[PDB]
Amino acid sequence: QCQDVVQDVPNVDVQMLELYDRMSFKDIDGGVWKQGWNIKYDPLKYNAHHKLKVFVVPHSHNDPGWIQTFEEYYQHDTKHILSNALRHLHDNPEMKFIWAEISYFARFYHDLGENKKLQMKSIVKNGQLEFVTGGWVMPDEANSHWRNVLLQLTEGQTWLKQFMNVTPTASWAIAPFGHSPTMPYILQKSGFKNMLIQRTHYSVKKELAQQRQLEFLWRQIWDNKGDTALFTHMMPFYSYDIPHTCGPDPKVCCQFDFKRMGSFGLSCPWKVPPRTISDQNVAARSDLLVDQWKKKAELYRTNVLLIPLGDDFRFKQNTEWDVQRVNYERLFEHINSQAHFNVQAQFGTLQEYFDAVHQAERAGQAEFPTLSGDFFTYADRSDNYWSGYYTSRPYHKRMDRVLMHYVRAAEMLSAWHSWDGMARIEERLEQARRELSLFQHHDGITGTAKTHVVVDYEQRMQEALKACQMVMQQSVYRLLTKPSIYSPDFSFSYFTLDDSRWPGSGVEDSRTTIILGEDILPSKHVVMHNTLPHWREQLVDFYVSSPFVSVTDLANNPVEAQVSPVWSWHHDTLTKTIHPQGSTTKYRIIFKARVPPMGLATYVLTISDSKPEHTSYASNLLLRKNPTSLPLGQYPEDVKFGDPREISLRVGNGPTLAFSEQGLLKSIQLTQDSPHVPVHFKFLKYGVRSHGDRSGAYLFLPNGPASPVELGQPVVLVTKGKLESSVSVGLPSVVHQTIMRGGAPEIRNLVDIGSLDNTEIVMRLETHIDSGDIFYTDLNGLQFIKRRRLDKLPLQANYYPIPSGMFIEDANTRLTLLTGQPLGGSSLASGELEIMQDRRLASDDERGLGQGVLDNKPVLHIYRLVLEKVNNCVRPSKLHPAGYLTSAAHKASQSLLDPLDKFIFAENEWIGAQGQFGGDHPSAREDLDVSVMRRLTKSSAKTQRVGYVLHRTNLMQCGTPEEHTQKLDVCHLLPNVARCERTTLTFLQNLEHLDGMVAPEVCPMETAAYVSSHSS
Ligand SMILES: *[C@@H]1O[C@H](CO)[C@@H](O)[C@H](O)[C@H]1NC(C)=O
Ligand SMILES: [Zn+2]
């Protein structure tokens, strides 16, 4: 019996939206604890029978790229940290150390000799070195897709299981800029029992500290029962550094960072240095430190206290290891032997802390509050809200989503077969998984790294994309070639991928033209892949060398097609206009491809002398004053010209869209009779303050509300076809395109902020929808959370991550904007949605980057815009913290994130070609996805194993019967199944042995993993 995720409002002790509504967010000087209060404790609270147990947990924050590349940091810092950790922990059996970033650890371990590898395994086995989380990285939680968060977790933990024989059940997230409940969701379904977070709004820290609610059972916003709950520890202070982790007073704590005495080139900003602990000072030093501890202990419910001891790239030098260890050893010996302190202090690990906490809990010493919600948007001080990185480096943000999909497609396409080692499938896939996983780092996708580091991430992702293409194309060739004919060269390109949207038209001329000709090649095979587990029809396009091309399927059935020109926009530095030029030698052919669930479908493009029967040609209308001619070679329809004017378009029986004379949407009419609903696109700009704090890669600090971009009299291009129409306009910084295929329009923005310093470009939608102060944004492409605009907070605080979609609604109408890339956005007034396109910032914003953002490049952002009637929809009550997509909006999101893949046959003739693969695959219910299909065994394994991650979303019931689908049982997708098991999401632990080898489908909002075993 599935939990109902719509109708029952969870009863929880803290609900973060409710908390937000109540809190005053005053930023007052709380004293030595600047954002708290002077903590008082009763010295009689602890005694002989009730001691304070203190765990000091040494750690070292290692960024996989930030100010230096991954390899640069590894060479200069991390390899030394790990080498000296091995030595010092080996030699000092009571010393402890926690490690988070497996990308660095794997890099190090593989360079070790066998002697050292064994020493390393020993200190892990004995508990001295403990892995926390065990992901490839410590990912950003704002921009990251849940699928990639899982990918990187799996990458690190699979490595740890194989080489260290351990799987972390405690998570450590000290650094992501705000925190998402997507983390406890994934972690709890991956065997975790505890997690730790740090970067939350200073006001939230204060509020929760006051109620001792810094430790909580974090459940999902829709979870009535509490089964998703994961124990969470929120750190109470401003930083994870040593001054902000011993207790409330950094002036005191800094004195217990023994790296800060001078020889290391570090010091205490509070002007009192650390002093070496001696017999003459240990009593006084201990009195100071124990007092700090006991103050921190006031903020929590048990007699077990966590004291992290670390900072960025700490525990490098041998001398640093000694200086920290020896001084702390002296403090522990004194403190533990002075009964009057009633403290037992020691080095410990994160798991040890959590174990002792739950022992206190079980002894009836504490009960913990329940909590739901998220921890965006983070501010570490004053009005410095970290909403800028929701948008920074948007090119690579978009790239992340493209690579996300190519990794899935490559792993899925290649999973169907076992491959010979010589094929290098596993090699290429591991590379792709690792480069994407690396980019999930909280300085990767966030766009907060130095210019040369961003370049490194981009290069790595480009290599991953090539790896995916190689795997995908070899897989297509095998799946669609008669087996007795199949003769692979594992280095040969049988197909090239054709991608219409990445890097995108106007970004890179990368697409190949299918060159046909009576005197060279009459025809060309193309293949579409559909990674979704349901039948899909979708328009696909290819470049061809002639407009006289027709399409057939592999049964030679004619397929209706449309040919359009290839239009490119040019900032004409002579006329000072932005205007389109048409190709005279290549054309776009568009047709509907119909592709099996998780399958393949083949089509043939054939040239003729004249207009083919089943091919139509789009009309084109250029709207501008002072037109010049636009010849189009063989294209059979002459371009038409006119003065700027309002226009209306309708494709198929879909919506009718009206545009302004500047080429921007002004209204949508859903059906013939229905109203023309005001929906207006507008481009505006935010600036930067000329006094006080400046915006940078992290911070969004606007100098007031956005000002409209002055548009002049822009050139508007209207293309009208039977299958696809569009309106495109050359705006300053943006070629804005609205594309229509008979349903929700697609929006593409080619964004080039050029040399506009201290500017952020925003795309806004203005409607009449009576949303008031409510809007919805998603978390990690997993769930939609209710947002409430708060005027008591500054503009930038009302910006949230838009990792994949946002909506506003009233009783009757909803507008949903879906994205192909994470960007920052808000609803700043009733009826509005807005989302940032790019930002170019001259100054550094004081968080350590030491540069602005002046490395912008052209990016093609993609969207779907869904206007819907929702009055018949069964929606959550007004008190529910969640929202849910409709079927239409969810399908539009899928179109952006997981489109059909397109393959062009490279050679002249494809001998033994087949028309279809997967025609017999079950077409599963629309709310179910096979998020991951991955073969887990190499070819030499007698028992083959294939892992599946199934995700079921929740779609609103709006009265559409939408019925008759087949049960998807992933365990029978490959033949000769011998066993079927439910696993953790990482595939690392078997949870359930499945009757009849049948994998059940999952509940709405649930995610499960299954592994099928095959004897043949
Ligand atoms: C892996 O750890 C387990 C306990 O979880 C132990 O039984 C097994 O021997 C270990 N594998 C080794 C030491 O190779
Ligand atoms: Zn970091």
Swiss-Prot record:
Top EC category: hydrolase
Cell location: Golgi apparatus membrane
InterPro entries xref list: AManII_C (IPR041566), Gal_mutarotase_sf_dom (IPR011013), Glyco_hydro/deAcase_b/a-brl (IPR011330), Glyco_hydro_38_C (IPR011682), Glyco_hydro_38_cen (IPR015341), Glyco_hydro_38_cen_sf (IPR037094), Glyco_hydro_38_N (IPR000602), Glyco_hydro_38_N_sf (IPR027291)
Gene Ontology molecular functions: alpha-mannosidase activity; carbohydrate binding; mannosidase activity; mannosyl-oligosaccharide 1,3-1,6-alpha-mannosidase activity; metal ion binding
Pathway(s) per entry: Protein modification; protein glycosylation
Catalytic reactions on record: N(4)-{beta-D-GlcNAc-(1->2)-alpha-D-Man-(1->3)-[alpha-D-Man-(1->3)-[alpha-D-Man-(1->6)]-alpha-D-Man-(1->6)]-beta-D-Man-(1->4)-beta-D-GlcNAc-(1->4)-beta-D-GlcNAc}-L-asparaginyl-[protein] + 2 H2O = 2 alpha-D-mannopyranose + an N(4)-{beta-D-GlcNAc-(1->2)-alpha-D-Man-(1->3)-[alpha-D-Man-(1->6)]-beta-D-Man-(1->4)-beta-D-GlcNAc-(1->4)-beta-D-GlcNAc}-L-asparaginyl-[protein]
Keywords associated with the record: Disulfide bond, Glycosidase, Golgi apparatus, Hydrolase, Membrane, Metal-binding, Signal-anchor, Transmembrane, Transmembrane helix, Zinc
Disulphides: none
Positions bound to Zn(2+): 61, 63, 175, 442
SMART domains reported in the protein's UniProt record: Alpha-mann_mid (SM00872)
Record topology, Lumenal segments: 1-1016
Signal sequence, renumbered to the chain: none
Name of the protein in question: Alpha-mannosidase 2
Native species: Drosophila melanogaster
